[PDB]
Amino acid sequence: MSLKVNILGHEFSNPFMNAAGVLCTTEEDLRRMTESESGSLIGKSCTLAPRTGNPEPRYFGLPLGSINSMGLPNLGVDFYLSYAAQTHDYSRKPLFLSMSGLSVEESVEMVKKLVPITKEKGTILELNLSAPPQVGYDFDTTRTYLQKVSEAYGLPFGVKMPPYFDIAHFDMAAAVLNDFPLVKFITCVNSIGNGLVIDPANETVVIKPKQGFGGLGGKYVLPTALANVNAFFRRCPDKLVFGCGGVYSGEEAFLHILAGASMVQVGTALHDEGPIIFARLNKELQEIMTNKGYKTLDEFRGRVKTM
Amino acid sequence: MSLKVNILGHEFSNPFMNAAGVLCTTEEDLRRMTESESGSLIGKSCTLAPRTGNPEPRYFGLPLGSINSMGLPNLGVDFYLSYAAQTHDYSRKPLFLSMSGLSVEESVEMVKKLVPITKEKGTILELNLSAPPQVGYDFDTTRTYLQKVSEAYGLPFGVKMPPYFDIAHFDMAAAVLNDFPLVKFITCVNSIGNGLVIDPANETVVIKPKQGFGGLGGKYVLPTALANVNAFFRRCPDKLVFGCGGVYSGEEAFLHILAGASMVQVGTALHDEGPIIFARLNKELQEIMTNKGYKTLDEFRGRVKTM
Ligand SMILES: Cc1cc2nc3c(=O)[nH]c(=O)nc-3n(C[C@H](O)[C@H](O)[C@H](O)COP(=O)(O)O)c2cc1C
């Protein structure tokens, strides 16, 4: 069977990639992702200038997933642009970059710098609209960001969206996104935002920033992610959907693809296991496809049955 | 040692009650709740006329909790009002009624009928603003509901709120809530809405309504529930917060109370175990308290520690 995905002119060996934020902040991280069995990789959501991020502790591994308030620690746009122009081996896998300016102006200035590298190297942009006020939760601000970034970048790009939990919100988000033809992929989803974990032994929160409030990832998010994937697969047929959330196995990948996902992103589980996970995910998805008699992902993508 | 709670002019033997929707639709359900070791009970979110709800399957138990699209099945407001006025034994425990009119006008008519019974029996109102755009996700609609209900009911009442996932949303919700002094309790939280569960074997969704989309309950929602409880505990200090989400043990109950919860509601776990859980929860909470040297709930309520 084939795990290949053919999108934006590129051939991906498999649908699997890292979720933005995990094993993607430094050059060592990026080499490790490139040397992995992953089909692609994405860089840490970057800012115009370097950020060191939030105070410690800011990450807590849970039995059911993860909580985090990292604070967008990143080496700055110039670092990721340089990796994309001079360091990355595009013969290994295609490269994506996440940009998370804390204002539309910052995002425009960054996006402008990427244009020449995309043209020469094929580096794909994922605009983050779900950085912990979340842009995805204001449909007016979202339109402004897509307007301004579409004009500045002038090239195909995608968007990391916050999870929606309302059918009307799926509709309202789809209506904005469908007014922007340069948005070719929608990544669903970012962390379930602003959760609180408390340790019963010390009666204390487990992360220092934001009084313990942090984004939830892992097993807590699979149902939410699958829903967002399917809702945007159906409402945005002129676009691709990338799945992110709750993937620990080939089974969860299969479910993401069945819901409509082209690429599948792994976060918490990759934070837990390391890049060796990509080799397990390829093997498990292959086994599932072999058992169901699917020869390509295209035979079942978005083909989830309803009653 | 005491698990007692003095709120809303009442004494509650303990903080535990059922979550609206679970063991509260029929009189048999309400008798079993009154006969339980629970401190209170709440009736099913009712509509002006009776409803049979959605087609089957409409509920699916999961390893990590529940997915549901019940469709607000209820025997009509007249039935719940009759239970509150004639059947319910107030010497056993205080009674709550959940009202979920699908319009402002419907809710107004329903709450107007409650006024005389609240005056005579003490029946307490929880207004559902989180029934499957969900009212709580539209702050202008929410203000209207609150304005009209305050006008028509004219007595202290409570609100069932949807889970929020954004700091600005917490602030915006509280701002609306803090303009209505008749709102004395905020129940956080209703289901994490519009999730999607797919069975990998049959490639099919597990609930029939809404193409498989339903509200999530159980272990999936605890960190979200704790966050909303604490956020409204801090932002709405002239009000009480009720905790709802992910309670399967005394541990989860302790955590909710530490975050600010006066009453703790139990849904998915009650569906799984039956009304006996109230006896286990009472015992497990006392155990934790004995092990921590606590005699009353007031010694730890809202005393979650930050760093
Ligand atoms: C430590 C950490 C850092 C993250 N950083 C980013 C980030 O920079 N940009 C982003 O768009 N998402 C970021 N995320 C969110 C993940 O990409 C992903 O959307 C979320 O964790 C859900 O996927 P999972 O269930 O596989 O973890 C981060 C998550 C974690 C745990």
Ligand SMILES: Cc1cc2nc3c(=O)[nH]c(=O)nc-3n(C[C@H](O)[C@H](O)[C@H](O)COP(=O)(O)O)c2cc1C
């Ligand atoms: C079968 C079922 C029916 C529910 N019906 C209602 C309802 O009528 N009104 C309501 O406000 N919440 C309703 N809920 C939500 C619960 O009250 C609760 O907010 C949610 O299940 C999260 O708590 P849990 O983690 O204990 O399940 C329902 C939940 C379930 C599982």
Ligand SMILES: O=C(O)c1cc(=O)[nH]c(=O)[nH]1
């Ligand atoms: O860097 C972070 O804090 C971060 C960014 C983002 O978009 N999502 C997340 O969960 N964390």
Ligand SMILES: O=C(O)c1cc(=O)[nH]c(=O)[nH]1
């Ligand atoms: O009856 C239902 O469908 C229902 C109502 C509500 O408020 N919440 C929920 O999860 N289900």
